[PDB]
Motif scaffolding. Structure first.
Motif, mmCIF file in Angstrom:
data_model
loop_
_atom_site.group_PDB
_atom_site.id
_atom_site.type_symbol
_atom_site.label_atom_id
_atom_site.label_comp_id
_atom_site.label_asym_id
_atom_site.label_seq_id
_atom_site.Cartn_x
_atom_site.Cartn_y
_atom_site.Cartn_z
ATOM 1 N N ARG A 73 11.124 -8.317 -5.460
ATOM 2 C CA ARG A 73 12.039 -7.684 -4.521
ATOM 3 C C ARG A 73 12.059 -6.170 -4.726
ATOM 4 O O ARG A 73 11.425 -5.628 -5.639
ATOM 5 C CB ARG A 73 13.448 -8.282 -4.679
ATOM 6 C CG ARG A 73 13.490 -9.789 -4.431
ATOM 7 C CD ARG A 73 13.211 -10.118 -2.948
ATOM 8 N NE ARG A 73 14.220 -9.515 -2.077
ATOM 9 C CZ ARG A 73 15.453 -10.001 -1.927
ATOM 10 N NH1 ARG A 73 15.808 -11.099 -2.583
ATOM 11 N NH2 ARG A 73 16.328 -9.390 -1.126
ATOM 12 N N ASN A 74 12.803 -5.473 -3.849
ATOM 13 C CA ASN A 74 12.920 -4.022 -3.844
ATOM 14 C C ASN A 74 14.380 -3.666 -3.554
ATOM 15 O O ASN A 74 14.690 -3.049 -2.534
ATOM 16 C CB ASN A 74 11.993 -3.410 -2.798
ATOM 17 C CG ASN A 74 12.052 -1.912 -2.761
ATOM 18 O OD1 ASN A 74 12.676 -1.254 -3.612
ATOM 19 N ND2 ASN A 74 11.402 -1.348 -1.758
ATOM 20 N N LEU A 75 15.275 -4.045 -4.473
ATOM 21 C CA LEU A 75 16.711 -3.951 -4.181
ATOM 22 C C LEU A 75 17.196 -2.510 -4.075
ATOM 23 O O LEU A 75 18.221 -2.250 -3.431
ATOM 24 C CB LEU A 75 17.506 -4.695 -5.252
ATOM 25 C CG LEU A 75 17.314 -6.215 -5.253
ATOM 26 C CD1 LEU A 75 18.159 -6.889 -6.361
ATOM 27 C CD2 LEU A 75 17.621 -6.818 -3.884
ATOM 28 N N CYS A 76 16.523 -1.562 -4.724
ATOM 29 C CA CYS A 76 16.892 -0.163 -4.583
ATOM 30 C C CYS A 76 16.236 0.492 -3.372
ATOM 31 O O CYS A 76 16.454 1.683 -3.131
ATOM 32 C CB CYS A 76 16.549 0.584 -5.877
ATOM 33 S SG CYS A 76 17.557 0.015 -7.273
ATOM 34 N N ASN A 77 15.422 -0.263 -2.629
ATOM 35 C CA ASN A 77 14.774 0.197 -1.395
ATOM 36 C C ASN A 77 14.030 1.519 -1.598
ATOM 37 O O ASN A 77 14.178 2.485 -0.831
ATOM 38 C CB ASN A 77 15.809 0.297 -0.261
ATOM 39 C CG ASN A 77 16.365 -1.076 0.128
ATOM 40 O OD1 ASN A 77 15.608 -1.998 0.448
ATOM 41 N ND2 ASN A 77 17.683 -1.219 0.088
ATOM 42 N N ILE A 78 13.192 1.541 -2.636
ATOM 43 C CA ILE A 78 12.392 2.722 -2.989
ATOM 44 C C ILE A 78 11.018 2.282 -3.445
ATOM 45 O O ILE A 78 10.840 1.207 -4.037
ATOM 46 C CB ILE A 78 13.045 3.546 -4.121
ATOM 47 C CG1 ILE A 78 13.373 2.638 -5.313
ATOM 48 C CG2 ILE A 78 14.255 4.308 -3.618
ATOM 49 C CD1 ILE A 78 13.877 3.370 -6.518
ATOM 50 N N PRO A 79 10.022 3.137 -3.235
ATOM 51 C CA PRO A 79 8.760 2.951 -3.961
ATOM 52 C C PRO A 79 9.007 3.233 -5.437
ATOM 53 O O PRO A 79 9.694 4.195 -5.793
ATOM 54 C CB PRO A 79 7.826 3.992 -3.338
ATOM 55 C CG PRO A 79 8.747 5.064 -2.845
ATOM 56 C CD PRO A 79 10.033 4.384 -2.444
ATOM 57 N N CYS A 80 8.400 2.417 -6.306
ATOM 58 C CA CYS A 80 8.555 2.656 -7.734
ATOM 59 C C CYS A 80 8.144 4.068 -8.120
ATOM 60 O O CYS A 80 8.704 4.640 -9.062
ATOM 61 C CB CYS A 80 7.752 1.610 -8.527
ATOM 62 S SG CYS A 80 8.274 -0.086 -8.288
ATOM 63 N N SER A 81 7.168 4.649 -7.424
ATOM 64 C CA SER A 81 6.764 6.029 -7.709
ATOM 65 C C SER A 81 7.924 7.017 -7.642
ATOM 66 O O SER A 81 7.891 8.053 -8.310
ATOM 67 C CB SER A 81 5.661 6.445 -6.732
ATOM 68 O OG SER A 81 6.134 6.399 -5.385
ATOM 69 N N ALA A 82 8.924 6.755 -6.805
ATOM 70 C CA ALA A 82 10.095 7.636 -6.734
ATOM 71 C C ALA A 82 10.826 7.721 -8.062
ATOM 72 O O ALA A 82 11.532 8.699 -8.325
ATOM 73 C CB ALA A 82 11.054 7.142 -5.661
ATOM 74 N N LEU A 83 10.703 6.694 -8.888
ATOM 75 C CA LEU A 83 11.313 6.681 -10.206
ATOM 76 C C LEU A 83 10.569 7.536 -11.223
ATOM 77 O O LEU A 83 11.006 7.618 -12.376
ATOM 78 C CB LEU A 83 11.388 5.243 -10.681
ATOM 79 C CG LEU A 83 12.185 4.299 -9.779
ATOM 80 C CD1 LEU A 83 11.952 2.877 -10.304
ATOM 81 C CD2 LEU A 83 13.651 4.648 -9.874
ATOM 82 N N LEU A 84 9.449 8.150 -10.848
ATOM 83 C CA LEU A 84 8.688 8.998 -11.756
ATOM 84 C C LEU A 84 8.909 10.480 -11.490
ATOM 85 O O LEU A 84 8.368 11.325 -12.225
ATOM 86 C CB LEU A 84 7.196 8.673 -11.664
ATOM 87 C CG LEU A 84 6.811 7.207 -11.937
ATOM 88 C CD1 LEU A 84 5.285 7.078 -11.887
ATOM 89 C CD2 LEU A 84 7.342 6.717 -13.264
ATOM 90 N N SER A 85 9.709 10.804 -10.479
ATOM 91 C CA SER A 85 9.924 12.187 -10.084
ATOM 92 C C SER A 85 10.624 12.998 -11.177
ATOM 93 O O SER A 85 11.389 12.471 -11.993
ATOM 94 C CB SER A 85 10.755 12.215 -8.806
ATOM 95 O OG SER A 85 11.036 13.534 -8.413
#
Ligand SMILES: [K+]
Ligand SMILES: [K+]
Length: 129
Positions: A73-85
């Motif tokens: 799933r994608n419960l935070c509705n983000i690409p995981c790459s956004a978590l690397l910013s």
């Protein structure tokens, strides 16, 4: 980006994590320390094929989309790459959903094993907050 300790404390506080769901700022800094060593570009592959991303090592099975975690799933509705910013907004806003899911900060196994019950205030001592 590799944050300094106090730098990350200040950014986390600005984004609402201090006492969020009752967890003091030091808990979040301690968790980021042992999850990612304060590195927003940290990644860790898990045996189930999911991957942990960013300063709080948020996992693709439930929380973000990376296109390579079957059934996830994608419960935070983000690409995981956004978590690397270098900008931690996405990581913080997703972390808030995670810590609200029922088990509090036990969702971060590193927090449970290395921060929970310790003098976590030490992680923000000396910081201009
Ligand atoms: K996927
Ligand atoms: K709790």
């Amino acid at each position: 980006k590799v944050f300094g300790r106090c730098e990350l404390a200040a950014a986390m506080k600005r984004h609402g994590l201090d006492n969020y769901r009752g967890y003091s700022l030091g808990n979040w800094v301690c968790a980021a320390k042992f999850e990612s060593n304060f590195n927003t570009q940290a990644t860790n592959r898990n045996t189930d094929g999911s991957t942990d991303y960013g300063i709080l090592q948020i996992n693709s099975r439930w929380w973000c989309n990376d296109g390579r975690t079957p059934g996830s799933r994608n419960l935070c509705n983000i690409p995981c790459s956004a978590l690397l910013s270098s900008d931690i907004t996405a990581s913080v806003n997703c972390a808030k959903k995670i810590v609200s899911d029922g088990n509090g900060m036990n969702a971060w196994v590193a927090w449970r094993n290395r921060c929970k019950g310790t003098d976590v205030q030490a992680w923000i001592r000396g910081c201009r907050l």
